[PDB]
A paper describes a structure:
The human AAA+ ATPase p97, also known as valosin-containing protein, a potential target for cancer therapeutics, plays a vital role in the clearing of misfolded proteins. p97 dysfunction is also known to play a crucial role in several neurodegenerative disorders, such as MultiSystem Proteinopathy 1 (MSP-1) and Familial Amyotrophic Lateral Sclerosis (ALS). pmcp97 is a member of the classic clade of AAA+ ATPases and is an essential cellular enzyme. p97 is composed of six protomers forming a homo-hexamer with an N-terminal domain (NTD) and two tandem ATPase domains D1 and D2 (1). p97 is an essential protein in regulating cellular homeostasis from membrane fusion, Endoplasmic Reticulum-Associated Degradation, Mitochondrial-Associated Degradation (MAD), Chromatin-Associated Degradation to NF-κB activation (2). Critical functions for p97 include the translocation and restructuring of proteins from large cellular structures such as organelle membranes and extraction of ubiquitinated client proteins to facilitate their degradation through the ubiquitin-proteasome system. Here, we present cryo-EM structural analyses of four disease mutants p97R155H, p97R191Q, p97A232E, p97D592N, as well as p97E470D, implicated in resistance to the drug CB-5083, a potent p97 inhibitor.
R155 is located at the N-D1 interface in the ADP-bound state making contacts with polar residues from the N-D1 domain. Mutation to histidine may disrupt interactions resulting in greater flexibility of the N-domain, consistent with disorder in this domain, observed as a decrease in local resolution in the N-domain cryo-EM density. This finding is consistent with previously published NMR studies where the N-domain flexibility, i.e., exchange between “up” and “down” conformations in the ADP-bound state, is inversely proportional to the charged/hydrogen bonding nature of the residues at position 155 (17). In the p97R191Q, p97R155H, and p97A232E mutants, the primary variation in conformational outcome as compared with p97WT is observed when the D1 and D2 domains are both occupied by ADP. In these mutants, the ADP-bound conformation of the D1 domain displays many of the structural signatures observed only upon ATPγS binding to p97WT, suggesting that these mutations shift the conformational equilibrium toward promoting ATP binding. This effect is most readily visible in p97R191Q, with p97R155H and p97A232E displaying similar effects in the D1 domain, but of a smaller magnitude. Our results demonstrate that the effects of the N-D1 mutations are mediated chiefly through the destabilization of the N domain in the ADP-bound state, either through a loss of interdomain interactions in p97R155H and p97R191Q or through inter-protomer steric effects in p97A232E.
Numbering used by the authors:
A (entry chain B): 21 to 707, 728 to 775
B (entry chain C): 259 to 707, 728 to 775
Write the structure that this text describes.
């Protein structure tokens, strides 16, 4: 069966054309590490690349870069063949000839300062007719050689010479413009794109396979997320690299024209796509198309909605087409569009976290070179509420500030601009600070759905609850068969109570990182926003967004905070229930336990929670967290003192044992006060980057004791009453 | 329609509004005329809630024109030829009441979400075209799903087929124009694909009314033989022997309300009574009854009785009936008493219902001192049954009912374990068994780095035994039961003649 085929997968490296394979492949075809390898593709063409050993990616696959993607005319989800070529190659001359498709507005010599620093210390083989992208000069341009020495025998070496003419050639339709968006041009969302990879690659790359079987492929995919998340770009990328026609109608181009022909344009948009099969249809804005919730106005609005419904209800097999739609909120879409056969498949895209925003930084700033002291890791940590488009706009605006500080004193007034100076427009630290301070975030009040960055080492002590949480939520996931064999269901939620200021959010956040799952945050103020708003529909989709991003964990903070505004044990004439208590448990009653989701309930006063929440079946696990012991506060303090420098004479064992009625927050505020007071001495002595023992005695003066003695007994009597292990604590069975 | 030799014509819902105004009515008119010529024929409307939204829309000049055109076309359907008009929708409240008049839509039928025995059938009715393995069964996979629409299961099967073929098509890499049938048949599906497909699936009807047939019988409930005869002699006798009740001239009872300590299986006896009588079962729990106290929508309690009476025979179940009073106070609470916007809706609808219909109302509550006396009036809910704490001989059966699924060792003694509990209700025993069988898995996992429970997992499990029913509520319930019973003074008397 010709055991040489390989599946095509997107690579992870950000370098030039370098492929990644697995460890048995190295000995399968007798290759070494640093050797030149030849690849054979379609259209009767060859390629040259470099093999790289990797053991983490997969067991049997290749990771092929964007350059040779388009160079070899091979798309994702295709067949490919590889073979060794241990031949000595020593290049001697190269012909340079760019294409005027993208070389516009750039004059001067762009071959001695632009291609020169990129080829050295690379040792990458080149082939006659290669298409590769390079960076420099606030823009990117490809390259293509039309006449040179016959390939093979081309290796980048200093002895090679160069010669330019200065007459670009006209491009043809045989190749594809690499300047378009590819699969590797989307960052910050890896779990969401993998679902599309296993949803769209089959019906598009294998039309006859689905035409021969009785499986009905999805006819509609709904895209979620705040505006600017990248919904349009995902649709543009999944269609341009599959050989399928892409047709885009955004949202208002239909309503802009006169009534009567707007429906005809929509109808012909579907008909033109069928002829160019396989094809795809993407709708950028649809919430403005079908506002059939509260609008109830306009005669032609419902006509357009019904026309769209008719056009997609009638989508029989015939040809291959996928309809894509994008919006801002799931509640802004006509429910008639969510029926089966129209939009039965849905996907939600959230705001990327630090590890996602980091990637979206370089994926946009790759075209400009940075300095040796400018890093994107620290700048991506302060931003938390920025949309994926916010970061791209921030980079573009920071480029303007970087060039403005020098263009005034340069004063180069001319018609054309050379490329010898546009590349030297480096950006420094002073520009990102101003750009990030001036930027205006868009999604600041959306649901906080990100992956935390805290582990078990950040929480000191509390070893008693660590085992209880470890034996409850990882066992059903890691060993599902054991729970099914006995015949009982695993627990669905854990609620804990204790004095305020004991890291009730830290253990809920850390449990998500060690289990490799998402994390949601529904705090108290976020739970009091609909008690007055008289809108019970917002609590509806907070569970949908959690179950779609499985696995995930639901966190509730100060669960009784609503009762404080209404009273408490007695309060008004009512009891301990309101318009929001009855909505928390009604939705989680009917959910499937089999789903990889969890509910965490954090509260300070457990005597106010209604017994209906604590009923067996919804929240039966009760854990009481007491005050930290002497041996735990040392770890708690050293976890917070990890970032700030610590002197050698700083003793922590004695400092931790002198606190008795201090909770977790009381230690953190003491450390904050000490390290703040350290800066005062450093500034006053300026007219040293290390803390000393003198900054402590002046900091423990402001030590606060929030947890008084009245609440300790109140919590202990409740915990003992709810535990009740007396009378039959030690008994031996006869048989 | 396809298997009766009759012409079938389908217009869904939006194909009328898609075209320009003026000819949409003409298309509807000619759709009826073309069907008459091909007699016998039939007419089916897929979507109609989008056709006649004459409740709150009140917009569009041509919308009411189309609604009136449909009304005129069906009001004029004289004998002439043979035609049946079919219409489909999502909710009964989303249809114009003018269409429900006689001669237009006088006959109605409701289709609910199938239960396990129905979803099982819908599994093979779609997966018959693909052969399965010897270790892949559809019985267990249909039990976890409860909120999936009939189309959800078909979509799940199709998506699981894609996952089953994807795990092999990558390593096969058969790139060709045509495909042979010698390899498409060998695409068997295994256990790893249904789990992923069922986890990734998104159910559609998760919050609809739970109208299914239960899967519990009298053997699942241990003890409580006193109430079994009372429930057996009350709801089966009028159905099995209707003539005896009519001969005496009195009417059978319409509902039974019982009270007791929480955690005594107040739902189990209501569910089991439906299986032995071969009837449907509805579930209206407390949270489902508190959703319209704040929603200010009293129209939702309207059709919960209609859906129950259409699926005759059926039984209505109410859980923690006083749960609304907790959010409003209780015996005193606010300046009001023990009635609100939902108490007056529960009994007003069941006052005018026909007793002859095969329906029943079950009322479950924990505190009977808070229920308003209007509910307990003779004629609506007159039967009062008090369920006390289980006895020693009943807890053995209660525990062995729960221990049926999990393996039980030969040295496990249950008679001694049941007699050492005095103030423990039904839930206290079930939670103990749950804790024991959960702690068993911990030892099994720790010893991996045995599929049978032992006696060592018990002593560590009864440590977490909780006692929810305290001594304050027992006397409060007993004094209420004795007050409501009152069989003193004339308990034993012989008539002279
Ligand atoms: N996740 C992302 N990866 C790469 N580029 C992005 C991402 N999100 C936004 N961008 C950039 O910002 C722009 C956002 O526009 P787009 O997402 O197409 O509109 P919408 O946000 O309405 O879908 C994109 O054109 C792209 O250049
Ligand atoms: N075991 C611990 N390890 C690390 N930090 C802790 C620990 N216990 C408490 N803290 C600190 O207490 C602070 C308060 O956390 P938080 O989750 O708000 O407490 P609560 O549960 O009262 O809301 C956190 O910032 C955390 O650093
Ligand atoms: N006689 C019994 N047989 C079987 N199970 C019982 C019995 N009595 C109580 N139980 C258990 O008690 C649990 C609580 O049931 P539930 O209907 O919630 O009680 P309540 O009537 O308080 O609602 C059930 O899961 C059931 O297994």
């Amino acid at each position: 069966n010709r055991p040489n085929r390989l599946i095509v997968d997107e690579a992870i490296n950000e370098d030039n054309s370098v492929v990644s394979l697995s460890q048995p492949k190295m000995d399968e075809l007798q290759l070494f590490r640093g050797d030149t390898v030849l690849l054979k593709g379609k259209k009767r063409r060859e390629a040259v690349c470099i093999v790289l050993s990797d053991d983490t990616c997969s067991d049997e696959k290749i990771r092929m870069n964007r350059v040779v993607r388009n160079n070899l005319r091979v798309r994702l989800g295709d067949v490919i063949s590889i073979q060794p070529c241990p031949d000595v190659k020593y290049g001697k001359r190269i012909h340079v000839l760019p294409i005027d498709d993208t070389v516009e507005g750039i004059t001067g010599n762009l071959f001695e300062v632009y291609l020169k620093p990129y080829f050295l210390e690379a040792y990458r083989p080149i082939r006659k007719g290669d298409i590769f992208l390079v960076h420099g000069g606030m823009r990117a341009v490809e390259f293509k050689v039309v006449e040179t020495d016959p390939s093979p025998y081309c290796i980048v070496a200093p002895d090679t010479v160069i010669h330019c003419e200065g007459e670009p050639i006209k491009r043809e339709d045989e190749e594809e413009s690499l300047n378009e968006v590819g699969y590797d041009d989307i960052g910050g969302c890896r779990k969401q794109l993998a679902q599309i990879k296993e949803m769209v690659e089959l019906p598009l790359r294998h039309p006859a396979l689905f035409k021969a079987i009785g499986v009905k492929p999805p006819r509609g995919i709904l895209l979620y997320g705040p505006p600017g998340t990248g919904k349009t770009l995902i649709a543009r990328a999944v269609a341009n690299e599959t050989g399928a026609f892409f047709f885009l109608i955004n949202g208002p181009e239909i309503m802009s024209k006169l009534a009567g022909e707007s429906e005809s344009n929509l109808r012909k948009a579907f008909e033109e796509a069928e002829k160019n099969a396989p094809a795809i249809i993407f709708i950028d804005e649809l919430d403005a198309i079908a506002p059939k919730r509260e609008k109830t106005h306009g005669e032609v609005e419902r006509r357009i909605v019904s026309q769209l419904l008719t056009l997609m209800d009638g989508l029989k097999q015939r040809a291959h087409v996928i309809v894509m739609a994008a919006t801002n909120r799931p509640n802004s879409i006509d429910p008639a569009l969510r029926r089966f056969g129209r939009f039965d498949r849905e996907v939600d895209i959230g705001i990327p976290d630090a590890t996602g925003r980091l990637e979206i930084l370089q994926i946009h700033t790759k075209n400009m070179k940075l300095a040796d002291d400018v890093d994107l890791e620290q700048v991506a940590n302060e931003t938390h509420g920025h949309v994926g488009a916010d970061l791209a706009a921030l980079c573009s605006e920071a480029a303007l500030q970087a060039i403005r500080k020098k263009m005034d004193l340069i004063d180069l007034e001319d018609e054309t601009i050379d490329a010898e100076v546009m590349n030297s427009l480096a950006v420094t630290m002073d520009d990102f600070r101003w750009a990030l301070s001036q930027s205006n975030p868009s999604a600041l009040r959306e649901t906080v759905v990100e992956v935390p960055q805290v582990t078990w080492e950040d929480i000191g002590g509390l070893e008693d609850v660590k085992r209880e949480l470890q034996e409850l939520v990882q066992y059903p996931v890691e060993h599902p068969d054991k729970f099914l064999k006995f015949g009982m269901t695993p627990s669905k939620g854990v609620l804990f109570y204790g004095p305020p200021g004991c890291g009730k959010t830290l253990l809920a956040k850390a449990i998500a990182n060690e289990c490799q799952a998402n994390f949601i945050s529904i705090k108290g103020p976020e739970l009091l926003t609909m008690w007055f708003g008289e809108s019970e529909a917002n609590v509806r989709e907070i569970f949908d967004k959690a179950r779609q991003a499985a696995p995930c964990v639901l966190f509730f903070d100060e669960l009784d905070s609503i009762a404080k505004a209404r009273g408490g044990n007695i309060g008004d004439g009512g009891g301990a229930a309101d318009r929001v208590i009855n909505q928390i448990l009604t939705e989680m009653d009917g959910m499937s336990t089999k789903k990889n989701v969890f509910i965490i309930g954090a509260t300070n006063r457990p005597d106010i929670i209604d017994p209906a929440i604590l009923r067996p079946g919804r929240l039966d696990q009760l854990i009481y967290i007491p005050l930290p012991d002497e041996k735990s506060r040392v770890a708690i303090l050293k976890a917070n003192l990890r970032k700030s420098p610590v002197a050698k004479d700083v003793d922590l064992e004695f400092l931790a044992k002198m606190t008795n009625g201090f909770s977790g927050a009381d230690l953190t505020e003491i450390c904050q006060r000490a390290c703040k007071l350290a800066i005062r001495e450093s500034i006053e002595s300026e007219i040293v980057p290390e803390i000393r023992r003198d900054h402590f005695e002046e900091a423990m003066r402001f030590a606060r004791r929030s947890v008084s003695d009245n609440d300790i007994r109140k919590y202990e009597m409740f915990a003992q009453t709810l535990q009740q292990s007396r009378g039959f604590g030690s008994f031996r069975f006869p048989s």
